[PDB]
């Protein structure tokens, strides 16, 4: 279903080429807003800041499946890179899914500490994340554990 | 942006508030020569559960008046028996622990009626509360005015607003928008009819805005609190303190 | 004069501004800050940093005992509102309400209640500099709160003060030993909460922070504490200091 | 990866021969996309397909 | 009543716009070149030819009072997509034009050789432009400010009457 | 001289509406951008296979808010999408200020995204 | 009557449409090959995941649980999401039809909470149900997928 | 370039909304101030270069009462004033001829002296 | 490419700070990084090792080859280069993948 | 007479270079998600007194 | 309307479709009426994005007869009484039948229907008219041939 | 020429347009590497007034495969005079383009038969000049108070005509600027006795 979407939507995309071409329009903005996040590669990749380097980047794909055997540490997306391909999923609605199987945000409170912080509301919440400073206190000065 | 007040309106026990406004109502009107009209139009008691949404609009028909004098207090008398006939038809599963008046006047006729059910508390507000604007809601309003008999009718006033915010940010956003159409009703409803591409669906009373678009319009009730105190009593909001102003926003 | 464009290029801005400290010797002080609360809430930032150079400079001169009681509310609430936009590491802000609360002593006193539950709040807000920012107001404010004679006040900044001392951000853990050392050097410290013998342990590992505020702040605080109160400290304690 | 595939440039004109991997190519002027052939009798001049 | 007002807008483009925008040292130059201009070796480049199977083109200069001596100069019309031809005397000017002559009766800025690709097909053009004494083709005189297409042996003049040409100029095609 | 208060009330009032833009004086301009989702609509026009026979080229030219005359050929871009009128060259003047403004309008957005998307727990 | 193949992971059978007795209508995993001339469905491609990498993605759950960091909790979590995310964004269709690698899903996130039920020194289901596991991050969960 | 140093930093700072841009007090001003013109520009050379930014509806070139020649400055009002915006800060500093513009914000006050010349300005622009 | 392997890593040994030092310098002065390159692949012709491991896959084991973090940028321009110029020459045909 | 400024041979809207486009591609390598969950994560201010046009709306 | 809120089509929504069918008669009668429901009252409702998804999803089971060809009944070509997005969900339905059964298939079963709104050759000349003008543009002219010989008949 | 199969991508065709499209705007838009080599300069700060310290008076195809040469002589001779050549490859931090101009005595391999002591003087000078100007901190150290003995038996001649056309260049950095700078004001303490000529160019 991706490859007949794409099929349809890079050839809308050539044809409001030449339309535009040929009559010394430019294209509006909400031609290409429905086919926005459609296409293999995507049509979004034909605007983003960087695609006049990009289009010197030459063998990408070979070079990241050489990765194995030169990094020990890889990335189990070899096979795509979205700065050529654009993110070729999405997934939010499966987090508001899952909230609601689960019964709802206050169902879901009712199991924790929200009451005891003194929190009026919840859709402020923000958890620590980490920051460049857990191990800024030493230097070499520091153990093996 | 938020009362420090009312955060124990929303602990786990079942609360109640009624408002007596718009029971007795009536029109002005003019007669075939030229005169004063009084006629009374269909009125309503408003009952809202302000954690769960539940609106329980028990309408009252124009027959009950037509036989009686001094209305104005026997009106306060008829919705006294209302909610008590209301609390009786809960199981007490469901019963509430208290009742809140928004009206002073009201705690005496209630409590003459609730004497069968002790343990339930009645007691008023130190808030202020813009429920006599609801009449002011659209769908709201049809129903009490296309009514022939006695009838109690429920509603949702939050519509779907809960399953992404609590219910202290959902009673926030009501009685921001029920004071935004009481002190100004036809400019507070250019505010939320401004786009006719979106919708309020069939059982929803409010337009189904997104996330952000209720952030905007948040912003722009307030300003409308905002500019029509100025209007009315002549300052510049440039001389409030910034406590004023939130006094002012909240009633 | 008092315009966004005036206030864009630094040089016009410090023309404009000692323009103003000048005639406000004659204008007066009340006339003058009358004046300077729009610049003070504007919704651009660099407007809104001119006027605070303006407010600090005239009250220097000229103190405050001309303002009336209602210049004296619309004066703080503007400071006020000019502490909660900033989003930049400016140092007026502070100088500025240091002027102010020097100024007027006593007359503070109703405006203390309300600025310490800003300053709670801001202490629990996700963006590290306005956290920074908020023990900062805190340290400008503790010789004018010890001068109210609020001293339930002073310890329940110190012991809220204690227990963010395990902030991992230095920039801000910083300004917290700061605010706890300025609270210290004010009180009985029998009568100080959490006592000193709770106090001076937890600052022992804090001298192995790396980062420069941490340290200079920490040293001043381990350095008041053994004039002060040497004998609240076991000492075997004192020499892992000397360590 | 280079090397690698230069390398295997030998072994598909080994198994191909000089003729067959012309067809698939294309001529050098204007050649072929994927799985493309200039006509039908290019295309079944050879079991290879 | 004799003036309404002295002072009176004038409403009409003077030399600085024009100037600036289409560059030369000093003088504007006139003919902007169309958007279908190509020089024949870009036109050979995209159909992809070696060179034995390329056309070119050259504008071989010979004198009026004599052809016998053979070029005056031979200038390969390849490279670029237009030639300016104009006025370069040789004893102080200013060079305006590629292709110079030592004619006094011609301006700095006299015709254009001006190359099109009109639906895939190269076509040589020629434009007077508006000089002062006038241009003739095939000792015919031509109107101005429009692209005449031009053959092969074709000779262009520099003056309107056969009194004041003293070099052609033959335009050849293979 | 309360005549005299008016005529120079006037002169103020002569002078702000001779100094204010026509664009201004007469509509929001929200809505000539919601005017392109009315052609958003019409996007819908197009797969219509009905469309095809009723559709003509009735070229109408290019006209401004108040109605006057515009630039033929495609311009270059503006932040309020404001179009050239038609006494303009075709010669793009600038010190460069708008594409560097476009640069930094496009940096506030990408920005937002990638707050929350390298954050590590 | 079969053509098969095996490509980048993927096992493909080929039917062409004349070949079988009775064209019935398939689910996902199943794809059309369209003659292109004509645009009509002239074959059908059946679909199913490689032997030797469902191998590969257990081989990969074991690593998970040997690693460094694989005693916090969140991490474990989180290097679930991007195995699981990066097996199902890659393969999509031949996940449906193939037996022996949803037996291997069922045992790898058996696994995985049973890392946190033991870190927490417990297996009682009253005090671990599903909110804990599955409640988004941004809610305080583990965000398990 | 005064103008143009203080968008730099107007544009740094992040501020990129127009109502809270240095801009905004001049909110209700159509006209701009053009200023270090070359001597040989004219009223309808004037409309060429400033029709980039939007459509002009006033112009006037100031030039003296006794020999007829340009100052070095005009006025010109547009349509909509957010062409102002435009003109100011993104034309400002433009060498044109050898010399650089100055564009401001501006009130305009006309004069009686250039009454006719209002007219003959006039009928040009009501042509488009 | 060279610097993404960074993006992620918390505490890095002696060998992984030379490593981004050398890259953080090649972006400070590219001009000189670019003369070295031409130098190696001119004149260098004797390499220093290559540290081999091997990663646990539990069905096989698989070698990671380490080069030396001063010829890797040398390299890294040289791949990028060499696909890019064979990518406009057309060496490789369709069919190869 | 006067020689155009070269356009390119499309043109766009201002808007296709103003989005972001691709900008969730600089990602950490374990986020599942494109942007916050709630909207108040993302906001700064949730409501700002504007003085400037709250006083020329009562004036 | 949970299937309009995807992207693209899929089978998993076809495949579930023809289970319930398939196993009692209500099933059938409630697929039945719905149709009638999505052309008649809710075509204005959709997106052109929506009328993919939904053209695909009632021409592929009215392709393999869980659906009857009588059910395209209701439909009728005209001037008046068609909507521009209901057009678009007959391009859509259309397309999808002929991609399944191939074109020579799908003109034995429009032959044994009896559909007269969309093949009219009783009369009324402009909507014989509009018919083959809207086939053709479809890419079904082979469609069109019988209507073809009534109009030049008339004419 | 038939596709056997579909299009699912971008076409072949409309790719090379956006490849050619990037080699075009590839000179107008400036690399962010391109960016750091303009910006070491001192003239990257400057106005237009700034820079006019620089006028200021200082005083027939034919195709078909071939296999390349088998010695590439060519490429290897072109490029040995801006890399390899002859230097200290060890004691500067970098070597510009420029440096090839102004100090070229050490750039140059006339190793013995130099031009009897004058001329093994006047190699010094510009080993020190180079030295001070890109050496690291233990040459620039040392090379600067050697520099300040050896100018008084130096002639004042040899130094300011040396030094002095280094502050001319427009490749110059900031840190540069500042050495050269600090060279001449040690060597004018110490000499005293200065000419005309040399005074103006100062």
């Known amino acids: 279903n991706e490859f007949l979407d794409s099929q349809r939507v890079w050839a809308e995309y050539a044809t409001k080429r030449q339309e535009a071409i040929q009559q010394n329009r430019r294209l509006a903005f909400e031609e290409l807003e429905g086919s926005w996040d459609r296409g293999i590669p995507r049509i979004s990749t034909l605007f983003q800041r960087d695609r006049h380097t990009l289009a010197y980047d030459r063998g990408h794909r070979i070079r990241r499946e050489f990765k194995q055997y030169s990094l020990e540490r890889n990335s189990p997306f070899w096979w795509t890179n979205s700065h050529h391909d654009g993110k070729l999923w999405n997934l939010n609605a499966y987090r508001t899914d899952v909230i609601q199987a689960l019964g709802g945000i206050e169902t879901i409170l009712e199991h924790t500490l929200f009451k005891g912080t003194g929190f009026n509301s919840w859709e402020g919440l923000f958890w620590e994340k980490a920051s460049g400073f857990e191990d800024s206190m030493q230097f070499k000065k520091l153990t093996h554990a | 942006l938020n009362s420090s007040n009312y955060a124990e309106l929303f602990n786990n026990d079942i609360k109640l508030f009624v408002d007596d406004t718009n029971v007795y109502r009536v029109t002005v009107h003019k007669t075939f020569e030229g005169n004063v009209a009084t006629k009374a139009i269909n009125g309503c008691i408003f009952t809202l559960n302000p954690k769960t949404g539940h609106l329980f609009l028990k309408i009252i028909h124009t027959s009950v008046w037509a036989g009686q004098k001094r209305l104005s207090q026997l009106a306060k008398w008829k919705t006294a028996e209302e909610v008590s006939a209301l609390v009786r038809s809960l199981p007490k599963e469901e019963q509430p622990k208290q009742i809140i008046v928004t009206r002073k006047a009201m705690l005496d006729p209630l409590e003459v009626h609730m004497l069968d059910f002790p343990n339930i508390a009645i007691r008023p507000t130190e808030l202020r509360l813009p429920f006599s604007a609801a009449m002011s809601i659209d769908k709201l309003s049809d129903v009490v005015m296309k009514a022939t008999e006695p009838q109690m009718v429920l509603f949702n006033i939050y519509d779907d607003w809960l399953d992404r915010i609590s219910s202290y940010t959902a009673f926030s956003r009501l009685t921001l928008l029920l004071r935004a159409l009481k002190t100004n009703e036809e400019s507070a409803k250019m505010i939320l009819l401004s786009d006719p591409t979106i919708t309020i669906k069939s059982y929803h009373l409010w337009p189904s805005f997104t996330d952000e678009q209720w952030i905007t319009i948040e912003s722009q009730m307030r300003d409308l609190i905002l500019t029509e105190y100025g209007r009315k009593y002549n300052v510049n909001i440039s001389a409030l303190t910034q406590t004023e102003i939130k006094d002012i926003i909240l009633g | 004069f008092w315009v966004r464009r005036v206030a864009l290029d630094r040089p016009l801005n410090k023309v404009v501004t000692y323009t103003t400290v000048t005639l406000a ?219 | 990866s280079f090397i690698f595939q230069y390398y295997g440039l030998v072994i598909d004109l080994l198994l191909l021969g000089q003729e067959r991997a012309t067809d698939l190519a294309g001529p050098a002027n204007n050649p072929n996309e994927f799985m493309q052939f200039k006509s039908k009798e290019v295309e079944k001049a050879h079991p290879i397909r | 009543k004799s003036q309404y007002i002295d002072i009176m807008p004038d409403f009409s483009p003077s030399g600085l716009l024009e100037l600036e925008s289409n560059n030369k040292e000093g003088i504007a130059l006139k003919h902007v070149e169309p958007q279908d201009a190509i020089s024949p070796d870009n036109y050979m480049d995209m159909l992809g030819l070696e060179a034995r199977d390329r056309t070119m083109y050259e504008l071989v200069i010979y004198r009026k009072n004599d052809k016998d001596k053979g070029p005056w100069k031979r200038y390969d019309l390849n490279g670029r997509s237009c030639y300016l031809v104009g006025r370069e005397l040789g004893h102080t000017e200013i060079v305006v034009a590629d292709i110079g002559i030592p004619e006094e009766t011609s301006s700095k800025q006299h015709c254009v050789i001006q190359f099109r690709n009109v639906r895939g097909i190269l076509k040589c053009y020629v434009m007077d432009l508006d000089s002062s004494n006038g241009t003739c083709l095939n000792n015919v005189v031509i109107p101005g400010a429009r692209y005449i297409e031009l053959r092969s042996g074709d000779v262009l003049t520099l003056s309107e009457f056969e009194e004041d040409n003293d070099y052609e100029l033959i335009f050849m095609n293979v | 001289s309360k005549y005299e208060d008016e005529k120079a009330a006037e002169r103020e009032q002569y002078l702000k509406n001779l100094n204010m833009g026509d664009v201004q004086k007469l509509g929001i301009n929200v809505d000539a951008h919601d005017k392109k989702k009315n052609q958003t609509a019409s996007s819908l026009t197009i797969e219509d296979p009905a469309i095809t026979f009723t559709h003509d080229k009735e070229r109408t030219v290019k006209t401004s808010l108040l109605g006057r005359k515009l630039y033929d050929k495609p311009a270059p871009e503006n932040r309020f999408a404001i179009m050239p009128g038609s006494r303009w060259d075709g010669v793009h003047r600038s010190n460069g200020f708008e594409e560097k403004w476009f640069a930094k309008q496009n940096e506030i957005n990408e920005k937002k995204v990638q707050s929350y998307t390298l954050q590590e727990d | 009557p079969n053509l098969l193949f095996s490509m980048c992971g993927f096992e493909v059978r080929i039917l062409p449409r004349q070949r079988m007795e009775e064209v019935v209508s398939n689910d996902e995993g199943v794809w059309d090959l369209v003659d292109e001339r004509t645009k009509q469905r002239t074959a059908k491609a059946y679909l199913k995941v490689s032997e030797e990498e469902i191998k590969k993605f257990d081989s990969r759950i074991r690593g998970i649980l040997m690693a460094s960091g694989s005693t916090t909790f969140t991490k474990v979590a989180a290097k679930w999401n991007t195995s699981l995310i990066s097996l199902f964004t890659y393969f999509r269709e031949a996940i449906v039809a193939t037996e022996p690698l949803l037996d291997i899903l069922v045992k790898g996130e058996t696994r995985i909470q049973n890392r946190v039920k033991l870190g927490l020194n417990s297996k009682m289901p009253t005090r671990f149900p599903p909110a804990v596991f599955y409640t988004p991050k941004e809610l305080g969960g583990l965000g398990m997928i | 370039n005064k103008i143009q140093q203080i968008n730099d930093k107007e544009l740094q700072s992040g501020i990129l909304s127009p109502h809270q841009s240095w801009h905004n007090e001049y909110k209700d001003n159509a006209y701009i101030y053009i200023g270090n013109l070359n001597r040989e520009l004219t009223e309808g050379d004037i409309l060429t270069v400033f029709s980039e930014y939007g459509v002009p509806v006033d112009v006037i070139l100031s030039r003296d009462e006794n020999t007829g020649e340009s100052q070095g400055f005009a006025y010109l009002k547009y349509e909509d004033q957010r062409s102002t915006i435009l003109a100011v800060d993104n034309l400002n500093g433009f060498k044109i001829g050898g010399r650089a513009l100055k564009i401001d914000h501006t009130f305009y006050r006309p004069k009686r002296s250039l009454q006719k010349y209002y007219e003959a300005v006039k009928e040009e622009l009501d042509r488009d | 490419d060279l610097k993404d392997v960074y993006a992620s890593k918390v505490r890095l040994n002696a060998s992984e700070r030379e490593e981004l030092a050398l890259i953080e310098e090649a972006y400070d002065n590219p001009h000189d990084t670019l003369n070295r390159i031409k130098k190696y692949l001119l004149t260098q012709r004797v390499f220093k090792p290559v540290d081999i491991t091997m990663m646990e896959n539990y069905q096989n084991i698989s070698p990671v080859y380490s080069v030396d973090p001063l010829e890797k940028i040398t390299d890294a321009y040289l791949d990028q280069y060499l696909w890019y110029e064979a990518d406009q020459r057309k060496l490789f045909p369709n069919w190869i993948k | 007479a006067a020689k155009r400024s070269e356009q390119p041979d499309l043109q766009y809207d201002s808007r296709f270079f103003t989005r972001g486009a691709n900008a969730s591609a600089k990602r950490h390598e374990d986020q599942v998600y494109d942007n916050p969950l709630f909207v108040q994560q993302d906001i700064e201010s949730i409501y700002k007194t504007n003085y400037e046009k709250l006083d020329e709306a009562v004036n | 309307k949970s299937s309009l809120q995807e992207s693209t089509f899929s089978k998993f929504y076809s495949i579930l479709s023809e289970r319930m069918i398939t196993f009692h008669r209500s099933w059938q009668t409630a697929y ?83 559909l007269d709104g969309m093949f009219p050759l009783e009369g009324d000349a402009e909507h014989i008219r509009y018919s083959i003008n809207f086939f053709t543009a479809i890419g079904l002219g082979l469609l069109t041939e019988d209507m073809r010989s009534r109009l030049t008949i008339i004419q | 020429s038939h596709q056997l199969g579909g299009q699912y991508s971008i076409p072949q065709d409309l790719r090379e347009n956006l490849q050619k499209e990037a080699a075009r705007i590839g000179e107008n838009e400036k690399d962010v590497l391109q960016e750091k080599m303009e910006t070491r300069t001192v003239q990257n700060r400057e106005d237009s007034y700034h820079k006019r310290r620089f006028d200021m008076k200082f005083e027939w195809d034919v195709k078909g495969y071939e296999p390349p040469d088998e010695s590439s002589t060519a490429v290897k001779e072109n490029s040995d005079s801006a890399l390899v050549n002859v230097e200290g490859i060890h004691d500067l931090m970098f070597f510009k383009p420029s440096d090839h101009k102004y100090f070229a005595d050490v750039i140059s391999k006339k190793p013995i038969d130099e031009l009897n002591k004058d001329e093994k003087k006047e190699r010094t000078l510009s080993m020190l000049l180079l030295k001070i100007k890109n050496g690291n901190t233990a040459s620039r150290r040392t090379s600067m108070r050697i520099l300040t003995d050896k100018a008084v038996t130096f002639g004042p001649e040899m130094i300011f005509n040396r030094l002095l056309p280094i502050l001319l260049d427009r490749s110059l950095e900031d840190q540069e600027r500042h050495l050269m700078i600090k060279t001449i004001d040690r060597v004018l303490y110490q000499l005293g006795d200065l000419t005309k000529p040399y005074v103006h160019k100062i």
């Open chain 11, 32 to 114: 039945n009426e719905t149709f009638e429901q999505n052309y008649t009252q809710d075509i204005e409702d959709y997106e052109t994005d929506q009328l993919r998804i939904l053209g695909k999803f009632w021409g592929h089971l009215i392709s393999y007869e869980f659906l009857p060809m009588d059910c395209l009944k209701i439909i009728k070509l005209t001037e008046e009484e068609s909507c521009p997005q209901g057009r678009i969900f007959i391009k859509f339905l259309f397309q999808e039948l002929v991609n399944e059964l191939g074109l020579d298939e799908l003109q034995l079963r429009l032959n044994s229907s009896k």
């Open chain 3, 25 to 243: 010797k004659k204008l007066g002080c009340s006339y003058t800050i009358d004046k300077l609360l729009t610049p003070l809430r504007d919704e651009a930032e660099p407007f809104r940093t001119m006027a605070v150079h303006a407010v600090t400079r005239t009250v220097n001169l000229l103190g405050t005992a001309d303002l009336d009681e209602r210049l004296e509310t619309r004066l703080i609430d503007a400071l006020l509102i000019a502490f909660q936009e900033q989003t930049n590491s400016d140092s007026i802000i502070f100088k500025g309400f240091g002027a102010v609360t020097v100024s007027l002593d006593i007359r503070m006193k109703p405006f203390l209640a309300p600025i310490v539950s800003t300053i709670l709040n801001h202490l629990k807000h996700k963006t590290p500099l306005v956290r920074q920012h908020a023990a900062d107001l805190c340290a400008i404010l503790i010789p004018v709160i010890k001068n109210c004679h609020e001293f339930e006040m002073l310890n329940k900044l110190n012991i809220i003060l204690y227990e963010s001392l395990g902030e991992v951000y230095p920039e801000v853990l910083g300004s917290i030993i700061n605010a706890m050392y300025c609270i210290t050097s004010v009180m009985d410290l029998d009568k100080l909460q959490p006592p000193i013998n709770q106090i001076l342990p937890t600052l022992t590992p804090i001298l192995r922070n790396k980062h420069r505020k941490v340290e200079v702040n920490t040293i001043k605080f381990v350095g008041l504490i053994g004039k002060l109160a040497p004998t609240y400290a076991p000492p075997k304690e004192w020499m892992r200091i000397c360590f």
